[PDB]
Amino acid sequence: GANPYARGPNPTAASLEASAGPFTVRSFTVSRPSGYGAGTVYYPTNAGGTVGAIAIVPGYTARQSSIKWWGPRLASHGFVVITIDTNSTLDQPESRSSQQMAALGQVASLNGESSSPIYGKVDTARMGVMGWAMGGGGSLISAANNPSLKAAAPQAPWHSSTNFSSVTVPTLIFACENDSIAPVASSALPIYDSMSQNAKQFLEICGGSHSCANSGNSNQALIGKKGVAWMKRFMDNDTRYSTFACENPNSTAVCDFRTANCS
Numbered sequence: 001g002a003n004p005y006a007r008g009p010n011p012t013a014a015s016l017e018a019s020a021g022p023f024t025v026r027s028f029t030v031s032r033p034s035g036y037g038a039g040t041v042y043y044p045t046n047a048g049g050t051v052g053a054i055a056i057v058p059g060y061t062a063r064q065s066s067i068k069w070w071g072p073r074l075a076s077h078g079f080v081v082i083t084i085d086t087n088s089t090l091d092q093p094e095s096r097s098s099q100q101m102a103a104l105g106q107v108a109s110l111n112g113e114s115s116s117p118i119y120g121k122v123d124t125a126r127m128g129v130m131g132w133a134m135g136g137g138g139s140l141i142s143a144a145n146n147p148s149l150k151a152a153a154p155q156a157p158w159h160s161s162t163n164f165s166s167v168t169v170p171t172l173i174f175a176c177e178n179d180s181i182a183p184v185a186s187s188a189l190p191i192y193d194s195m196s197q198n199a200k201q202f203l204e205i206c207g208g209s210h211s212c213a214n215s216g217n218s219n220q221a222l223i224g225k226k227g228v229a230w231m232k233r234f235m236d237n238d239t240r241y242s243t244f245a246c247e248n249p250n251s252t253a254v255c256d257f258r259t260a261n262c263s
């Protein structure tokens, strides 16, 4: 009968483009990070059922600030989101992946901790990964190594190998047209093209620098719509979001759009 994971009101373009989703969001600092540097957990206070968890990792030299906007944006639509700082700002993608997954493990821990604000708020069987640049590469390594993850949505990803043919997790790649750090033609697009087994999508922002999907970007309506739609469709199996997840948004800000195996 009903989808047990469906949360919130039926979506519209306006409701997904808005700065905030329907749920009230609170946050806390992780007291003793388990296998990573630091974290902030964002959660809905009024979701009305358990929700999936998403761990988000920054790029080389970067901190939570670069990725923080995703925390309230996703949590307000019905997700527990952990943004992390890595053990070193100079960690590489394999270490970033390990830390991302340690952060998901700690969110699953806190779901069982009676003192935690997220006590009983998480469905530990439904998880996703996001991250910027080397943290985006780390997200793809997380997905390759943990195929029970339900979704991945890295931004401006880089890894030393572009071969993610092993990934079976639904994966949305945000790319930045004018990226001079991890050029689209040598990084994000080859990564996208390597993936053969999954639902996948590629969304490149016109004129974007390497930071085009970071906190303070000028395309939060489109990027936030797509990220939330992808996570709802695939983490919650929520087919109310099938068209938002799969469509070409046919937007003036999009300079390359590709999708395959989307439903």
Ligand SMILES: O=C(O)c1ccc(C(=O)OCCO)cc1
Pocket: 058, 059, 060, 132, 133, 134, 135, 158, 180, 181, 182, 183
């Ligand atoms: O995480 C990053 O921001 C980061 C991403 C990519 C690189 C790198 O040198 O790629 C070489 C291809 O241009 C370095 C740092």
